[PDB]
Write an enzyme that holds these catalytic residues in place. Sequence first.
Site, PDB file in Angstrom:
ATOM      1  N   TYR A 120      13.807 -48.908  66.309  1.00 46.22           N
ATOM      2  CA  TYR A 120      12.380 -49.161  66.129  1.00 46.22           C
ATOM      3  C   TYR A 120      11.627 -48.284  67.150  1.00 46.22           C
ATOM      4  O   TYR A 120      12.108 -48.070  68.287  1.00 46.22           O
ATOM      5  CB  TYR A 120      12.078 -50.670  66.317  1.00 46.22           C
ATOM      6  CG  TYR A 120      10.620 -51.037  66.132  1.00 46.22           C
ATOM      7  CD1 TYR A 120       9.925 -50.661  64.965  1.00 46.22           C
ATOM      8  CD2 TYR A 120       9.921 -51.727  67.126  1.00 46.22           C
ATOM      9  CE1 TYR A 120       8.581 -50.968  64.794  1.00 46.22           C
ATOM     10  CE2 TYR A 120       8.556 -52.045  66.963  1.00 46.22           C
ATOM     11  CZ  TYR A 120       7.900 -51.666  65.791  1.00 46.22           C
ATOM     12  OH  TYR A 120       6.570 -51.973  65.611  1.00 46.22           O
ATOM     13  N   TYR A 152       7.126 -56.406  71.838  1.00 51.94           N
ATOM     14  CA  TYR A 152       8.525 -56.100  71.551  1.00 51.94           C
ATOM     15  C   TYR A 152       9.275 -56.237  72.870  1.00 51.94           C
ATOM     16  O   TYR A 152       9.537 -55.258  73.548  1.00 51.94           O
ATOM     17  CB  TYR A 152       8.649 -54.697  70.983  1.00 51.94           C
ATOM     18  CG  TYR A 152       9.971 -54.405  70.300  1.00 51.94           C
ATOM     19  CD1 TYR A 152      10.314 -55.036  69.099  1.00 51.94           C
ATOM     20  CD2 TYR A 152      10.865 -53.484  70.839  1.00 51.94           C
ATOM     21  CE1 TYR A 152      11.511 -54.743  68.455  1.00 51.94           C
ATOM     22  CE2 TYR A 152      12.064 -53.172  70.190  1.00 51.94           C
ATOM     23  CZ  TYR A 152      12.373 -53.801  68.995  1.00 51.94           C
ATOM     24  OH  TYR A 152      13.554 -53.512  68.353  1.00 51.94           O
TER      25      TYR A 152
HETATM   26  N1  LIG Z   1      12.948 -56.144  60.737  1.00 49.01           N
HETATM   27  C1  LIG Z   1      12.247 -55.083  61.130  1.00 49.01           C
HETATM   28  O1  LIG Z   1      11.046 -54.990  60.922  1.00 49.01           O
HETATM   29  C2  LIG Z   1      12.948 -53.971  61.854  1.00 49.01           C
HETATM   30  C3  LIG Z   1      12.145 -52.759  62.267  1.00 49.01           C
HETATM   31  C4  LIG Z   1      12.973 -51.781  62.960  1.00 49.01           C
HETATM   32  C5  LIG Z   1      14.328 -51.992  63.186  1.00 49.01           C
HETATM   33  N2  LIG Z   1      14.959 -53.100  62.782  1.00 49.01           N
HETATM   34  C6  LIG Z   1      16.384 -53.211  63.078  1.00 49.01           C
HETATM   35  O2  LIG Z   1      17.169 -53.538  61.929  1.00 49.01           O
HETATM   36  C7  LIG Z   1      18.301 -54.317  62.335  1.00 49.01           C
HETATM   37  C8  LIG Z   1      18.457 -55.545  61.445  1.00 49.01           C
HETATM   38  O3  LIG Z   1      17.538 -56.560  61.839  1.00 49.01           O
HETATM   39  P1  LIG Z   1      16.629 -57.288  60.731  1.00 49.01           P
HETATM   40  O4  LIG Z   1      15.177 -56.984  61.016  1.00 49.01           O
HETATM   41  O5  LIG Z   1      17.210 -56.984  59.372  1.00 49.01           O
HETATM   42  O6  LIG Z   1      16.910 -58.843  61.032  1.00 49.01           O
HETATM   43  P2  LIG Z   1      18.196 -59.553  60.380  1.00 49.01           P
HETATM   44  O7  LIG Z   1      18.268 -60.945  60.950  1.00 49.01           O
HETATM   45  O8  LIG Z   1      18.160 -59.327  58.887  1.00 49.01           O
HETATM   46  O9  LIG Z   1      19.431 -58.718  60.982  1.00 49.01           O
HETATM   47  C9  LIG Z   1      20.061 -59.146  62.191  1.00 49.01           C
HETATM   48  C10 LIG Z   1      21.430 -59.744  61.874  1.00 49.01           C
HETATM   49  O10 LIG Z   1      22.372 -59.402  62.898  1.00 49.01           O
HETATM   50  C11 LIG Z   1      23.211 -60.525  63.173  1.00 49.01           C
HETATM   51  N3  LIG Z   1      23.671 -60.580  64.588  1.00 49.01           N
HETATM   52  C12 LIG Z   1      22.937 -60.859  65.675  1.00 49.01           C
HETATM   53  N4  LIG Z   1      23.726 -60.809  66.778  1.00 49.01           N
HETATM   54  C13 LIG Z   1      24.967 -60.498  66.361  1.00 49.01           C
HETATM   55  C14 LIG Z   1      26.273 -60.292  67.039  1.00 49.01           C
HETATM   56  N5  LIG Z   1      26.393 -60.414  68.382  1.00 49.01           N
HETATM   57  N6  LIG Z   1      27.346 -59.980  66.286  1.00 49.01           N
HETATM   58  C15 LIG Z   1      27.221 -59.861  64.959  1.00 49.01           C
HETATM   59  N7  LIG Z   1      26.050 -60.042  64.327  1.00 49.01           N
HETATM   60  C16 LIG Z   1      24.931 -60.355  64.987  1.00 49.01           C
HETATM   61  C17 LIG Z   1      22.388 -61.758  62.836  1.00 49.01           C
HETATM   62  O11 LIG Z   1      23.226 -62.789  62.308  1.00 49.01           O
HETATM   63  C18 LIG Z   1      21.402 -61.268  61.791  1.00 49.01           C
HETATM   64  O12 LIG Z   1      21.828 -61.694  60.493  1.00 49.01           O
HETATM   65  C19 LIG Z   1      18.079 -54.702  63.793  1.00 49.01           C
HETATM   66  O13 LIG Z   1      18.941 -53.918  64.620  1.00 49.01           O
HETATM   67  C20 LIG Z   1      16.634 -54.333  64.069  1.00 49.01           C
HETATM   68  O14 LIG Z   1      16.456 -53.895  65.418  1.00 49.01           O
HETATM   69  C21 LIG Z   1      14.307 -54.076  62.135  1.00 49.01           C
HETATM   70  N1  LIG Z   2      17.187 -57.971  64.945  1.00 50.32           N
HETATM   71  C1  LIG Z   2      16.307 -58.140  65.970  1.00 50.32           C
HETATM   72  C2  LIG Z   2      16.645 -58.942  67.047  1.00 50.32           C
HETATM   73  C3  LIG Z   2      15.713 -59.089  68.081  1.00 50.32           C
HETATM   74 CL1  LIG Z   2      16.112 -60.143  69.461  1.00 50.32          CL
HETATM   75  C4  LIG Z   2      14.472 -58.444  68.092  1.00 50.32           C
HETATM   76  C5  LIG Z   2      14.146 -57.641  67.015  1.00 50.32           C
HETATM   77  C6  LIG Z   2      15.061 -57.495  65.971  1.00 50.32           C
HETATM   78  O1  LIG Z   2      14.744 -56.698  64.918  1.00 50.32           O
HETATM   79  C7  LIG Z   2      13.475 -56.237  64.721  1.00 50.32           C
HETATM   80  C8  LIG Z   2      12.568 -56.985  63.963  1.00 50.32           C
HETATM   81  C9  LIG Z   2      11.280 -56.492  63.765  1.00 50.32           C
HETATM   82  C10 LIG Z   2      10.930 -55.254  64.318  1.00 50.32           C
HETATM   83 CL2  LIG Z   2       9.276 -54.592  64.066  1.00 50.32          CL
HETATM   84  C11 LIG Z   2      11.847 -54.512  65.077  1.00 50.32           C
HETATM   85  C12 LIG Z   2      13.132 -55.009  65.277  1.00 50.32           C
HETATM   86  O2  LIG Z   2      14.055 -54.312  66.013  1.00 50.32           O
END
Ligand SMILES: NC(=O)c1ccc[n+]([C@@H]2O[C@H](COP(=O)([O-])OP(=O)(O)OC[C@H]3O[C@@H](n4cnc5c(N)ncnc54)[C@H](O)[C@@H]3O)[C@@H](O)[C@H]2O)c1
Ligand SMILES: Nc1cc(Cl)ccc1Oc1ccc(Cl)cc1O
Lengths: 289, 286, 286, 289
Positions: free
Chosen positions: D172, D182
């Site tokens: 991100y 964040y």
């Molecule tokens: N959601 C957003 O807007 C966004 C924006 C930018 C980046 N991301 C990135 O995308 C990735 C997915 O996150 P998301 O937003 O889909 O939320 P999400 O909950 O769909 O994905 C996170 C998943 O990772 C699993 N997890 C957490 N700790 C773990 C561990 N120690 N071992 C194994 N699994 C574990 C959780 O069970 C959860 O299901 C993250 O790395 C996040 O930083 C998300």
């Molecule tokens: N998967 C996860 C865990 C934590 Cl503790 C914080 C943010 C996480 O994912 C995100 C969700 C929304 C945005 Cl905009 C960026 C992220 O990276």
Amino acid sequence: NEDICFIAGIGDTNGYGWGIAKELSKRNVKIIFGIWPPVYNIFMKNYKNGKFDNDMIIDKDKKMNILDMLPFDASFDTANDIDEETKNNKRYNMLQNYTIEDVANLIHQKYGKINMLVHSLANAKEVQKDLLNTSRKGYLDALSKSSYSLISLCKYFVNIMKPQSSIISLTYHASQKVVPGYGGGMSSAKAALESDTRVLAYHLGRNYNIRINTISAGPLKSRAATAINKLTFIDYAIEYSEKYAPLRQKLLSTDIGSVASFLLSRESRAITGQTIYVDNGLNIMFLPD
Amino acid sequence: EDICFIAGIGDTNGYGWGIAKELSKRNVKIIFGIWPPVYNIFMKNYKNGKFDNDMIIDKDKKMNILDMLPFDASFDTANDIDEETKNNKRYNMLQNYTIEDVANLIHQKYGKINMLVHSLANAKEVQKDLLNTSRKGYLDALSKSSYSLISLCKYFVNIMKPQSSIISLTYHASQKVVPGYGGGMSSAKAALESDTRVLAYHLGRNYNIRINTISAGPLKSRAATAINTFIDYAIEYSEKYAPLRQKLLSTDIGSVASFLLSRESRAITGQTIYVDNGLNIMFLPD
Amino acid sequence: EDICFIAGIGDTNGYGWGIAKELSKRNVKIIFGIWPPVYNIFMKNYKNGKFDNDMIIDKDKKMNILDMLPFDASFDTANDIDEETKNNKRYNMLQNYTIEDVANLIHQKYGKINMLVHSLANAKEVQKDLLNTSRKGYLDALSKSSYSLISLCKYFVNIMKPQSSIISLTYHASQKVVPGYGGGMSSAKAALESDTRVLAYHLGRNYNIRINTISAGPLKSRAATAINTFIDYAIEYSEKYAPLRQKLLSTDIGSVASFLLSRESRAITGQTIYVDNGLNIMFLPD
Amino acid sequence: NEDICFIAGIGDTNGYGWGIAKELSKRNVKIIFGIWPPVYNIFMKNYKNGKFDNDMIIDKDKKMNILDMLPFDASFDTANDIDEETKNNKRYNMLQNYTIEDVANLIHQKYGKINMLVHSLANAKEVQKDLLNTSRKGYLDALSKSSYSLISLCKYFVNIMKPQSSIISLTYHASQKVVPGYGGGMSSAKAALESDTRVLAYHLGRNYNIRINTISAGPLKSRAATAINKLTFIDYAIEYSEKYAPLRQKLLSTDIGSVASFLLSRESRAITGQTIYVDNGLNIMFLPD
Ligand SMILES: NC(=O)c1ccc[n+]([C@@H]2O[C@H](COP(=O)([O-])OP(=O)(O)OC[C@H]3O[C@@H](n4cnc5c(N)ncnc54)[C@H](O)[C@@H]3O)[C@@H](O)[C@H]2O)c1
Ligand SMILES: Nc1cc(Cl)ccc1Oc1ccc(Cl)cc1O
Ligand SMILES: NC(=O)c1ccc[n+]([C@@H]2O[C@H](COP(=O)([O-])OP(=O)(O)OC[C@H]3O[C@@H](n4cnc5c(N)ncnc54)[C@H](O)[C@@H]3O)[C@@H](O)[C@H]2O)c1
Ligand SMILES: NC(=O)c1ccc[n+]([C@@H]2O[C@H](COP(=O)([O-])OP(=O)(O)OC[C@H]3O[C@@H](n4cnc5c(N)ncnc54)[C@H](O)[C@@H]3O)[C@@H](O)[C@H]2O)c1
Ligand SMILES: NC(=O)c1ccc[n+]([C@@H]2O[C@H](COP(=O)([O-])OP(=O)(O)OC[C@H]3O[C@@H](n4cnc5c(N)ncnc54)[C@H](O)[C@@H]3O)[C@@H](O)[C@H]2O)c1
Ligand SMILES: Nc1cc(Cl)ccc1Oc1ccc(Cl)cc1O
Ligand SMILES: Nc1cc(Cl)ccc1Oc1ccc(Cl)cc1O
Ligand SMILES: Nc1cc(Cl)ccc1Oc1ccc(Cl)cc1O
């Protein structure tokens, strides 16, 4: 106007902390050294025995004046964080008030509020390993000592600093571009530190009117730099820099010091959150000659 | 005996003046390069004392201005001037104002210099969005705002000492989108920041001369007012959202310039240095 | 019925051809924009079967080329052509080759298109270092290599469907110093990468059209051979020091282009995408 | 040609892991889910009870095929790293082979070598705190779970992957530009991850002919995103993105999925070490309207 600067991370006269001290002293800033307890005793003995006197010579018109020299371990945020083993360790046992909070308090009690802060330290147990061969423990050690220490330093020092104060740290371009051998999570740690410098600039700026920047320095044969090699890394870096940098002069510790001094002064009042390269322009090159 | 040429002063309200003021603090001798269409207006206001308060540094000193010369970054040499310009009422009574001519004139009057400031830009279609900018308009922006730096360097290095230092001014629209910063000014600034690196390599290796660029935040200068309330918005946004809430002053850029032009920065070259109260570091307006 | 115009094919040895080959895999109809001084040479080699092996995709298919048209990115409209060009032996037997004319011709022959590739550059002083580049030479680089993209966009959007996609090719000399990449090509590429962002904003908001640029590694194309053994060095350095040791192929850039031009990349715009075997990530040659 | 992909980090159908699975499935890649033990049981029950069937619908011509679903905790490198408490914890007690090394071994034994790897997880105990108020423990937790987990994932999976394999993670833009809220060291963690992606690209590239990139995604209302708010953060981000991005369409999980799918395929053969923004172009903007 009694400028006072705490320099966290000096252990001899061969690193960037000393160059920074020297240049600040030239501007009449009072210097307080934060010295890591493993090297503290030997630092104090060498100093007392006059081993640093030549290195303290500014121009033979002037010599450095050091206000104070304090044991300091950036691994510990407060007294309550210090494990029983460390408290009782041979080198720590005779020292007090060396955690980040305690040194901030001690400085405040003896001298009141300060206006300049230098983070000039880093550490990583597995620096000799490539990233892929670094353990979880070793990686977290690099981040703890090299990156988190800045945040914590800021957290406790902001209370003893005046508005319009300034904070600098030192970073290296391996955060942005691949430097094989800069191992153990140090590249990761500098990347975190550069990013943290932005987030901190925002909060310190709005909530305290305090600036924070980081200097991405070129290679210098410091004691820490020598420890990077396995089985040297710094020799290669220096040779490469002097051959390929836009500026071929030898990079000096006081070259960084004079930039640090500018950034810590009011002259840099509109600069915060930045990584400033002081590396003879090496960072700008793609293809060598 | 430090001497600085500052190309791009039209009045006391832009960054050139702030840079002049700060260098004057360090007792640097200052020479102004003034765009010919405004040269005589400037000289008249100056003679009439309009700039006097703006020239005060403090209790002690007042700005020391060595010389003021007409300077047009549109033209490399005397041969490059078109007849329409030659026949212009503002140019016809002036001479030796091309880039080469001014280098020769400064060198003849005062000898070698050691500081060079490019503080100028122009774009005849700045009010149009990029997509509606014509070829002539886009190339004008690049000619006046980017190539002018290269040519300044080309002609001035000959009159400069080893270990001299050069700066220009850029803007963050080169790197992130600023709707409104039109006519190819964004392009010109991207080229300027890139050229600063390439020039740093060649000037460093060949002459031990440094070059850097300052990416400034918004200032209500004459040029800024010409971009289309754009400037009022940028200033308001900056003062609201920048990490530092202070009003950004021309002298805030000036003191950074003065540092970059001095030997205190001997190990810095090829860099874009942000002097904008930290605004560039922000993503999400809080 | 996807149609792509590819401006900048002169033979089968550059990135335009590789992009054409890969789009052909996905059954995209391809139209070549060919610089007039090489148009008739190209048509003759093509007719003579010189490109036949280069046109094979696999066991199944062979490149499907819809049309091949003369195209000169120096000129926006018929009015812009100088008499010397008009009176050139290579141009005199050709017509409707300005940017606007080619948009009108394609649209009249085939209707609206949905993919646009800018795969061209020129700089008359490429062999000079930046500091020795003249104003005319530097502006030529920007005119042919940067402004040409903006004008391509300006005239082609009218003949494009919503959700269309545009790419150009850049080089990392915009961002880090490559001695030898002269004549303002480095500047032109910096402007191109910046313009790509500004265009992305305007095209996205106004037309839902995307634009990106691919920063390619070195390829022994005809243009590359004209830079001064420079290319042999870059290739040798890349194959020695890039994270990936594979030889970089025009079709490696082509398959990224094809992805960027397809709807699979609907959420990517304004980006510089590096397709260079990872070389750009390196600092210290190991 | 039997493409197989391990996706580390799915717990429901609302995040990027699911969008990635869906798009890969469309290309006929076989999918193996690594599911964190706290959510594993509920994931399996919901799945068995058909709660995900609508979400598995590709185009009503096709539906997703999931090869396998495995308990997985990216906190633990090997069996020997698991503390006695965790081993015996109510949710872990009935599960086996869930460390990074054990899942790699298990996958290898059941299916042989794989060619695609997705790191789609992150965690940080103090995410709700601003950086300055984050503790040493909380910061190290963010780096351990969100950043080190990638390195470790790579270390153990490279042995079970074919040459020309590809690895992606998700990052991100808060790593590069300040996003208030964040918190907890997540910004620091993404900065480290982006930097580590370069160092890893170099070593994996030269020593295995394996590629690694990261996708900097725009905002998506995933379960994790919702947990960021204190006292919402994601609502603001989404609203802001849809109002100010060059592309105003709603950002979908499968938008990231189709880019992930490209990056994992041979079509991206000359791309490695990169941060690729898939965010409707929001990152390119300075000043809003
Ligand atoms: N959601 C957003 O807007 C966004 C924006 C930018 C980046 N991301 C990135 O995308 C990735 C997915 O996150 P998301 O937003 O889909 O939320 P999400 O909950 O769909 O994905 C996170 C998943 O990772 C699993 N997890 C957490 N700790 C773990 C561990 N120690 N071992 C194994 N699994 C574990 C959780 O069970 C959860 O299901 C993250 O790395 C996040 O930083 C998300
Ligand atoms: N998967 C996860 C865990 C934590 Cl503790 C914080 C943010 C996480 O994912 C995100 C969700 C929304 C945005 Cl905009 C960026 C992220 O990276
Ligand atoms: N030396 C170079 O070439 C170079 C290049 C770029 C950046 N830097 C940075 O400059 C900074 C200074 O390093 P250096 O090169 O001068 O080596 P140095 O040994 O001079 O500085 C490091 C000092 O920090 C102290 N220290 C280590 N851990 C500590 C802790 N937990 N608490 C308190 N003090 C501790 C050590 O005692 C040592 O004296 C480092 O952060 C380094 O990353 C150095
Ligand atoms: N003011 C801001 O907000 C701001 C922000 C970032 C960067 N800058 C940069 O600072 C520099 C100085 O501009 P400013 O903002 O102080 O406005 P300004 O009007 O004070 O300075 C621009 C000067 O350039 C001169 N000029 C125009 N065309 C010229 C030519 N062909 N030859 C010689 N001189 C010419 C004008 O006479 C004018 O005095 C510019 O390059 C600008 O891009 C300004
Ligand atoms: N080859 C490389 O190593 C490399 C690396 C990075 C980027 N690129 C970029 O890829 C693009 C394609 O170049 P290439 O390397 O395939 O060489 P190339 O010679 O195959 O392609 C350049 C083409 O542009 C055409 N052209 C020149 N001036 C023109 C004009 N005024 N109007 C229309 N067409 C004109 C030429 O006829 C030529 O066919 C260029 O923009 C180049 O900057 C190439
Ligand atoms: N101070 C320190 C500690 C460790 Cl473990 C590693 C490097 C360290 O400093 C450095 C030395 C040389 C270079 Cl080129 C970059 C550095 O950051
Ligand atoms: N000097 C100049 C000329 C033109 Cl045509 C456009 C902008 C110019 O200067 C600026 C003013 C305000 C801002 Cl925010 C950026 C600038 O670069
Ligand atoms: N097409 C073109 C024209 C000119 Cl004048 C210069 C370079 C050109 O293309 C390139 C070739 C090789 C490399 Cl490494 C980068 C390029 O951009």
